[PDB]
Design a protein around this ligand. Structure first.
Ligand SMILES: [Zn+2]
Ligand SMILES: [Zn+2]
Lengths: 497, 497
DNA sequence: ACTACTTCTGGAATAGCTCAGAGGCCGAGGCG
DNA sequence: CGCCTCGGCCTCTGAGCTATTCCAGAAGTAGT
């Protein structure tokens, strides 16, 4: 610093008048000078205008005098006055247009308070009161903002969540009982706007445009992300869900989920490694080498695992067993998805009978450009614009049908699931694993990684969590408690007992 | 003469805003056109904007319209209106900054009056006052509220419903006859707003948004609340409907409904337990164990019990008797629904009993993916994009058609209904049950859950309300009177009488 | 089916709101 | 004792937002 700043810190500028030549009169001013000069003017100004409020602050080894005047005055006069009392030093006084926000920012770092004609801050020209009967307009900006912070992407959810804020905050059972975080954290703030929102004739539009803005930023921020980064982010959100689940407060017996792991690890040879290999194939996403084929009988695990994996990295599954004149709206669900999963692809005529016939395989054989991922495609939605992008990678699960040579080639890897009675029986005595839908859950798989993969594998950015989580499982499940689960599962009894 | 004024006369430009293209809104405008047009506009402008004052003047072979509007408009809006009114050879619209100076100069030698609103000119005592009130318009919120309290999600229905309140509620037949709940309970309250409503041009819009509100809440709940909660929440709703139903205001004979309980309790063995069972199934939503199958002839009871249970947990009835591809929108109805009911499904092989062959059964077989609930499916809606979720659980009612031992394995419970004579004649002896739709009402099914099942077996949330409702029941209906009803109903005689 | 008529959505166009900058007007006092 | 300037008032305006209306075309529908 040149020891005397040439203007207010760029942290309060948006609250000050941007005028350069105006004879407008204000009632809220802010001077920025030296510690000694401020200290002095604090008393000179106080009486000079019979202020209704005033307060000195600290700013970058200097002072800032924020005061509210009863009557209106133009910065001109306020300035010409403070001048006469200095004759030297630096003095930059301006008009304040954001009273509260200004004072507010000044009471918090990097600004500190020193003096003030009122200990409890203030609420006059500024606010809590004086709201009176001015024209009430809804703030679309504030709705979108909300959507942004809650990373909202569903108009229905938004509309309903915001309508909740319409009600009084102080005595809101929902905020007291603190049921949903994405509510008790934004209500008080969005309360005023919401109440006005409850009267808007454009509710839907306000929400649609909001959610559209979030989807916008999201698609942009993705471009600046690797892909291993996207997976790390996903692992994070999944980990965030987990903290709440197995938390001191929440329905989620960590023991019941570790049971699923013990079950999912017997679904295939070296399960923990497969997932890792899988994840890498999805992260690297290599042209003509980004799809796996899960092939097997009904109730062989190919569906459960595919689902799990699908939730792990995040994404959606689609059903291409339909007329090509309806195959496009379905293919479109893949948009902006990390990975895709073609669930239960059917074939026509094949391998004897008892096998449902369908177009699923035919269709896939006419979507090589979608599987190869060499050239982008035009995924579409209703009433929207044909969004173009590289089709996401994924898995394809199918029964024992005949796969055309052309299609096969697009499957860098094929896994054959063979029914295991010792697994089927184990489940028949573990209702909770199907009840709480744990074997088809990605959280179940993520735990598995945390329990088998070395800390060094996961991204450095979150290795911290992985370690703390790993240690969490160690104390909870000794090399005995868990071994008991694997044993029972291998013997087909009951994961727990 | 050839000029045909490109702008207002120079000596007036001094009181005119020369930025016709702006967002500014004012209440004093001037139009420069020909004699005939001004004369025509004088009348059309007076009506369109219910001007506070208007006058026509002479300006070099042409006319000039000066007028004050009770409310602000932008010059462009005024100009745009005049345009679509008639044809012009030349037209100039400008805002007037200096009101009084504009008029006075228009009466000066250079110009002259031809006609005007108030005989006397724009006297300054009232040439720039305060605008007022602004005609009251329909309250969208208020309509929404109604749709909310009645959980209405049908725009067409809501529209018709709300239009009934337009009429006076004084000598209103429906209001006095206490014929409809969701009418005499709201009419008096919405009368005033419905009156305007009935004259609004956006009726369909208003309702469209009130519905989105109802849809929005369901989307929120399903996304946050747990299956238990949803049910309970549905019970509190049913209870709030029963109170008013059997209340002083209402007109429901609690002694007639309690009869239905006795009848229904004769449809199936341990019926009070079957309902508890059903509820558990629906609430636990366990993969492969979420669907029940009702099979029987007409008035076999299935149609009744199904409908009742459906209302108990609140769900939607579907119809899969369409082409295995034409039912993509009929299945989307399940979106955000607790439970669904595939009513009267048709099959094959019923020719033997004059049972029309359909696609229903064959369709359910190709939707085992939906009935199971192990994976999520993408549900469609007209003009809207796919919704990914696990298809809700429910019931499948069908007549005496054939069911492959492979399809039967898609259901955990199969309640076969058989014709009951001693139960039929009792319905003839008690013709009132059908008339008041008590036989297949979710209310009765709730009462039956109160006249049997334990108290602490309910949710600790609605315990108290169930306790005090279990009072009035026995405290009124003798512990034997019910027994006498559940007797003659097994004989063939009327319930009560 | 392929083609002719209807309902629905999103984006464009149109309209009204309030804020704060750039300046014009004017009584009252400073000063040689 | 009159030019000049201070300091509060007020309005015309560019701007950014919010509110309503319109509209071309896609999504869904009935029928040859
Ligand atoms: Zn709250
Ligand atoms: Zn009525």
């Amino acid at each position: 610093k040149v020891e005397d700043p040439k203007d207010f810190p760029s942290e309060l500028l948006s609250f000050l008048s941007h005028a350069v030549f105006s004879n407008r009169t204000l009632a809220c001013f802010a001077i920025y000078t030296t510690k000694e000069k401020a200290a002095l003017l604090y008393k000179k100004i106080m009486e000079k205008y019979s202020v209704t409020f005033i307060s000195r602050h600290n700013s970058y080894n200097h002072n800032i005098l924020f005061f509210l005047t009863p009557h209106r005055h133009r910065v001109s006069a306020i300035n010409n006055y403070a001048q006469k009392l200095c004759t030297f030093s630096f003095l930059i006084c301006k008009g304040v247009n954001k009273e509260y926000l200004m004072y507010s920012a000044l009471t918090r770092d990097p600004f500190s308070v020193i003096e003030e004609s009122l200990p409890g801050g203030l609420k006059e020209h500024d606010f809590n009161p004086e709201e009176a009967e001015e024209t009430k307009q809804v703030s679309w900006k504030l709705v979108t903002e909300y959507a942004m912070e809650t990373k909202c992407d569903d108009v229905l959810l938004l509309l309903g969540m915001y309508l909740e804020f319409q009600y009084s905050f102080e005595m809101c059972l929902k905020c007291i009982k603190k049921e949903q975080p994405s509510h008790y954290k934004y209500h008080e703030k969005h309360y005023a706007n919401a109440a006005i929102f409850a009267d808007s004739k454009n509710q839907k539009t306000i929400c649609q445009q909001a959610v559209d803005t979030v989807l916008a930023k999201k698609r942009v921020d993705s471009l600046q992300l690797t892909r291993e980064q996207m997976l790390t982010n996903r692992f994070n959100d999944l980990l965030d869900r987990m903290d709440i689940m197995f938390g001191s407060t929440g329905s989620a017996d960590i023991e019941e989920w570790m049971a699923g792991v013990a079950w999912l690890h017997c679904l295939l040879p070296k399960m923990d490694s497969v997932v890792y290999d899988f994840l890498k194939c999805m992260v690297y996403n290599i042209p003509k080498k980004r799809y796996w084929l899960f092939k097997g009988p009904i109730d062989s695990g190919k569906t459960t695992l595919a689902a799990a994996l699908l939730e792990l990295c995040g994404g959606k599954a689609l059903n291409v067993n339909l007329p090509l004149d309806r195959l496009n709206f379905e293919l479109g669900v893949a948009i902006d998805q990390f990975l895709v999963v073609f669930e239960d692809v059917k074939g026509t005529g094949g391998e004897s009978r008892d096998l449902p016939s369908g177009q699923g395989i035919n269709n896939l054989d006419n979507l090589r450009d979608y599987l190869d991922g060499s050239v982008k495609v035009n995924l579409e939605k209703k009433h929207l614009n044909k969004r173009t992008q590289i089709f996401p990678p994924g898995i394809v699960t199918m029964n024992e049908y005949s796969v055309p040579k052309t299609l096969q080639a697009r499957f860098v890897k094929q896994i054959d699931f063979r029914p295991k009675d010792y697994l089927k029986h184990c489940l028949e005595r573990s209702e909770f694993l199907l009840e709480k839908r744990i074997i088809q859950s990605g959280i179940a798989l993520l735990l598995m990684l945390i329990w088998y993969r070395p800390v060094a594998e996961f991204a450095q950015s979150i290795q911290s969590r992985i370690v703390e989580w790993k240690e969490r499982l160690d104390k909870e499940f000794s090399l005995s408690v868990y071994q008991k689960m694997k044993f029972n599962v291998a013997m087909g009894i009951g994961v727990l007992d």
